[PDB]
Design a protein around this ligand. Structure first.
Ligand code: DCP
Ligand code: CA
Ligand code: CA
Ligand code: CA
Length: 341
DNA sequence: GGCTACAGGACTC
DNA sequence: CAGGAGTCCTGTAGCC
């Protein structure tokens, strides 16, 4: 199998750049304002010009400002990047019917019957890069290898505006030299558990006893890391179908008062139904982020679809359940719909 | 034993 | 100082 992975560079920021070329060359930070106080919120992303100084996704907006006081700060316009992302995806489909759209800016394509070997794949990747450049003026990084995982790993080795190929020989090398934390699916909680049993490399997952690995990180992640180590990982490029749609909002002040929370919960439901488009969910969950940023949720499935009225009524109950089974104050409240008809 | 719901957890965008 | 969003997995309890 020959997988070709596409990942758009500095996406939200680059898009803002395309729409306002004047932003070219300056540090740009795309922000998500929570409305709690001037500047409350987090960074969604920023361009390289702002990332070389430490301003990266996930940090507090106020933190970004002390580092880059004259940087350009823009409010995230999700619908614009989504619309842009679609056009590029509809463009990637011309290169293969076997395509998995993994996120707002990533796509996997199976080009097993479009190229003979890697030299041809490489060329098809250069062609894809240019087509996107011309048609949307967005740069992208292309990763190419024998499976989704190594194709992704390839892309972020060649980020940004790059293209890299990890041949079958490179794969065996990576299995021995690549730090296992750099493997998709391994975050610091898991990395810490791995770099605690001298597992710092994929290869040394084969010498560790199976149940020792399982009991630590779980059966799924263990079989996953082992299949990669043996160079047997073969997940197919599947068409993705949205499984859940939701909305969550930050409240002006923390609270445990139902009537003070209700307005925010109801707005989340209204906006959720709008996004639901014409999908009919059979399950609903009320999700709350607490005082200490922990996440709590309670949900329910119905033998039939949930109407907006049933959503309103059920959401209060679920929220009441959260309030009596947990003593912490709420900071963000929202809903999530799933199990679509 | 193992499958289903449900709630916590981890990861990534 | 901590946004908004979505997917997959696990331990538990109920059940056949
Ligand atoms: N914490 C995050 C992570 C991701 N995203 C978004 C906006 C990013 O532009 C888009 C792509 O995420 P990446 O992790 O790929 O970051 P960038 O594409 O912005 O930078 P890079 O060149 O490293 O791919 O996803 C976000 O809003 N908040
Ligand atoms: Ca990515
Ligand atoms: Ca990207
Ligand atoms: Ca990592």
């Amino acid at each position: 199998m020959i997988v070709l992975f596409v990942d758009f560079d500095y996406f939200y920021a680059q898009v803002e750049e395309v729409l306002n070329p004047s932003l070219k060359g300056k540090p740009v930070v795309v922000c998500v304002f929570s409305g709690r106080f001037e500047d409350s919120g987090a960074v969604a992303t920023a361009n390289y010009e702002a990332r070389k100084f430490g301003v990266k996704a996930g940090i507090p907006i106020v933190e970004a400002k002390k580092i880059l006081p004259n940087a350009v700060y823009l409010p995230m316009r999700k619908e614009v990047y989504q619309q842009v992302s679609s056009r590029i995806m509809n463009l990637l489909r011309e290169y293969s019917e076997k395509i998995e759209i993994a996120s707002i800016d990533e796509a996997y394509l199976d080009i097993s019957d479009k190229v003979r070997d890697y030299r041809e794949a490489y060329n098809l990747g250069l062609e894809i890069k240019n087509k996107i450049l011309e048609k949307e003026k967005i740069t992208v990084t292309v990763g190419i290898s024998k499976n989704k995982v190594f194709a992704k790993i390839a892309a972020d080795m060649a980020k940004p505006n790059g293209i890299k190929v990890i041949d079958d020989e490179e794969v065996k090398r990576l299995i021995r030299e690549l730090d296992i934390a750099d493997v998709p699916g391994i975050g610091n909680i898991t990395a810490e558990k791995l770099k605690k049993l001298g597992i710092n490399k994929l290869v040394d997952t084969l010498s560790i006893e199976f149940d020792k690995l399982k009991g630590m990180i779980g059966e799924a992640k263990a079989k996953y890391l082992i299949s990669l180590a043996r160079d047997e990982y073969n997940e197919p490029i599947r068409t993705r179908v949205r499984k859940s749609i939701g909305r969550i909002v930050t409240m002006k002040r923390n609270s445990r008062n139902l009537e003070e929370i209700k307005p925010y919960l109801f707005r989340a439901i209204e906006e959720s139904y709008y996004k639901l488009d014409k999908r009919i969910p059979k399950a609903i969950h009320v999700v709350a982020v607490t005082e200490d940023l922990d996440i709590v949720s309670r949900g329910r499935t119905f033998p039939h679809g949930i109407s907006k009225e049933t959503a309103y009524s059920e959401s209060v109950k679920l929220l009441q359940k959260i309030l009596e089974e947990d003593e912490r104050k709420i900071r963000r409240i929202g809903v999530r719909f799933s199990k679509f008809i």
